[PDB]
Amino acid sequence: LLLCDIGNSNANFLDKYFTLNIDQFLEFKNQKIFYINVNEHLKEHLKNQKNFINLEPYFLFDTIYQGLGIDRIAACYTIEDGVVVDAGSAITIDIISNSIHLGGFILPGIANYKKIYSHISPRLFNTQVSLDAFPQKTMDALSYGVFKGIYLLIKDAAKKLYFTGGDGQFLANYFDHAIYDKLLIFRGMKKIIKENPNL
Amino acid sequence: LLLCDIGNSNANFLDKYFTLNIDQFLEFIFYINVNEHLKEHLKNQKNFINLEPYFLFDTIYQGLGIDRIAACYTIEDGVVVDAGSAITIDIIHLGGFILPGIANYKKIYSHISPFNTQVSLDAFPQKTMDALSYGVFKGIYLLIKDAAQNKKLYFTGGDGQFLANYFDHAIYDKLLIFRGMKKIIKENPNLL
């Protein structure tokens, strides 16, 4: 059972979890691969690979959010009630209540915060910065700005929390009653398959 | 008496307030400067007199920028927010924190994907531009609120009035920085 979650920078596979970059992904050959894809650039390519089978059409998900990404849908999908946070290149926060998508929002990913500080000034992280004291040096002034900004947005939006993505465990640790599941999305994909076994 | 607050995107002048962008300032005076790539050019200019070494300001914060010092210089008690290229939030000095300015939030998103300022903050967005706008505006809002846990609140800077509107009990002063700069010329009559 080979699953593929395709992004703008990475394709994450599950068989056993691995990550390829996009060049690597384009040279991959294999057996059936089930997939979701947000990369607009790879749509023609995927259509030419007959072994590749798009799960997106099977996702029924109650939202009015225009153009919601299939990646966010798939991560919300096994959740009945809760706040879903996928912390990678971007940080998306989605709110589920009663299997209904109430809305959601987007933040830069942590690496990107680091890039924009640099673009602003060479004068402009400590992951172990405290959130309950004002910072006293510039490293901490940045780390606090970023990490506390995300902490408060998520606190306000949240309800149980589910976390996923490369930075998800780190963000989860600021909260009690929160889970981290590296495989949230692949669980949504797993669920689609258990619901349409003719696949 | 001509004053200049030279920042990372803009040069705020007071002769009559008015602002140049950097590329303008270059083709354009007591000053403070946080623009690294402008250090050289300023030493070149003999009409410009740096005011930074005259400030004496107690803080337990190491390497506090001179724009923050200057903004904070005339405030006995409160949170001081300066919203430009970056947004500095300072406490009266018991510390403070920094964010990207609103336009620099734009720039990350615009590069990734080549703002709605009236976005509601009390409901969850349902389209991409609103999703972005709310992450930015509410993130800033929650941080200041949390920091100003009841203290006074002061805002300045090019985007400072916009942000002040989010608040009851808050004051915007476009000139808070030049007010530090004037108080320094005050304390140092010798400068004239």
Side-chain angles (χ1 to χ4, degrees):
Chain A
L1 184 85
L2 193 28
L3 304 170
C4 197
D5 153 41
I6 305 153
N8 288 307
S9 292
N10 312 299
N12 309 136
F13 288 86
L14 185 68
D15 248 302
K16 197 113 98 160
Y17 180 97
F18 68 101
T19 296
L20 317 169
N21 66 32
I22 300 321
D23 292 342
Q24 289 155 359
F25 168 78
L26 293 165
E27 296 302 312
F28 188 76
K29 195 137 189 200
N30 251 59
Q31 79 148 301
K32 258 178 195 72
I33 300 171
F34 302 94
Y35 77 93
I36 67 179
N37 168 56
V38 298
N39 191 323
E40 300 281 313
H41 295 290
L42 301 180
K43 289 190 199 323
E44 246 255 61
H45 177 83
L46 290 157
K47 218 220 169 277
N48 304 345
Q49 311 321 300
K50 303 162 192 183
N51 65 314
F52 268 86
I53 288 155
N54 190 0
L55 286 198
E56 174 159 8
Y58 299 90
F59 273 94
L60 317 188
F61 179 73
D62 194 345
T63 188
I64 54 171
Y65 185 122
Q66 310 172 9
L68 186 52
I70 192 38
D71 58 336
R72 297 171 63 191
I73 287 166
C76 290
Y77 203 52
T78 57
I79 287 131
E80 280 155 20
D81 298 279
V83 170
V84 188
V85 189
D86 190 2
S89 313
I91 290 176
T92 61
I93 301 99
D94 288 290
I95 301 75
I96 317 293
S97 177
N98 226 259
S99 292
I100 297 160
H101 178 242
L102 297 182
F105 56 101
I106 311 162
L107 258 29
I110 296 178
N112 275 347
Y113 276 110
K114 223 165 102 103
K115 272 184 63 164
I116 199 84
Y117 281 138
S118 286
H119 167 88
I120 301 161
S121 190
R123 286 202 213 163
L124 320 174
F125 300 153
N126 175 16
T127 62
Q128 302 303 305
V129 78
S130 146
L131 264 29
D132 305 296
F134 304 109
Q136 333 274 12
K137 55 193 224 160
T138 293
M139 163 165 300
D140 283 343
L142 302 168
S143 317
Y144 178 104
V146 168
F147 300 153
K148 221 212 187 166
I150 300 160
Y151 174 85
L152 298 170
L153 282 151
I154 291 158
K155 212 221 274 246
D156 178 74
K159 261 149 168 325
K160 322 260 185 100
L161 276 157
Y162 303 81
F163 271 94
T164 192
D167 286 306
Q169 184 58 79
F170 169 69
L171 294 178
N173 299 344
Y174 289 125
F175 292 99
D176 66 272
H177 295 154
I179 253 89
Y180 169 77
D181 182 356
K182 179 182 198 207
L183 311 163
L184 255 204
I185 282 184
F186 283 125
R187 294 195 142 207
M189 304 175 72
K190 231 126 199 207
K191 179 170 149 179
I192 278 324
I193 287 143
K194 77 154 260 279
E195 295 187 345
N196 313 254
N198 310 140
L199 300 173
Chain B
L1 197 88
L2 192 40
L3 318 174
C4 202
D5 168 37
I6 306 163
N8 278 299
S9 295
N10 295 287
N12 319 71
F13 281 90
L14 183 68
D15 196 349
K16 197 202 176 193
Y17 173 83
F18 86 81
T19 326
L20 303 168
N21 59 57
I22 301 305
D23 296 18
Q24 286 192 313
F25 169 85
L26 273 170
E27 242 188 323
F28 161 88
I29 298 82
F30 297 99
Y31 81 85
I32 60 170
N33 169 64
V34 294
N35 193 309
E36 266 313 309
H37 298 159
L38 284 192
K39 268 173 93 51
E40 45 193 344
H41 178 244
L42 281 148
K43 270 184 187 201
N44 253 351
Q45 311 296 299
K46 224 75 93 286
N47 42 309
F48 282 73
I49 288 90
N50 202 332
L51 288 188
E52 180 161 2
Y54 307 85
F55 293 78
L56 293 155
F57 177 88
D58 254 290
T59 168
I60 56 210
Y61 183 109
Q62 21 180 343
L64 193 64
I66 192 49
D67 58 335
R68 300 163 66 184
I69 285 159
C72 275
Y73 195 62
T74 66
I75 286 87
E76 299 89 323
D77 303 286
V79 184
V80 185
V81 176
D82 183 0
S85 300
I87 299 162
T88 67
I89 296 137
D90 288 300
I91 296 95
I92 329 303
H93 190 234
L94 317 171
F97 59 101
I98 298 158
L99 306 154
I102 290 156
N104 284 306
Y105 281 99
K106 244 257 131 264
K107 208 173 277 153
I108 21 203
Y109 293 144
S110 63
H111 286 249
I112 289 175
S113 305
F115 278 139
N116 169 25
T117 54
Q118 260 176 116
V119 55
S120 154
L121 267 34
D122 304 305
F124 295 135
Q126 252 122 335
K127 60 227 247 197
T128 298
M129 188 55 46
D130 287 11
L132 298 171
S133 301
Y134 170 117
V136 182
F137 308 141
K138 217 215 185 53
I140 295 174
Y141 176 75
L142 294 165
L143 268 157
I144 299 169
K145 195 171 85 193
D146 170 282
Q149 265 272 333
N150 303 24
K151 319 212 181 43
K152 275 173 180 69
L153 232 190
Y154 308 77
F155 281 91
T156 186
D159 282 327
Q161 173 71 72
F162 166 73
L163 290 174
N165 298 343
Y166 282 135
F167 288 94
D168 295 337
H169 324 314
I171 296 147
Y172 175 65
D173 170 357
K174 177 195 266 175
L175 299 164
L176 186 65
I177 284 201
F178 304 121
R179 282 172 219 272
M181 293 176 72
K182 274 147 143 69
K183 195 195 170 185
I184 269 281
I185 296 190
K186 179 95 178 268
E187 299 168 322
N188 290 284
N190 25 296
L191 289 176
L192 303 155

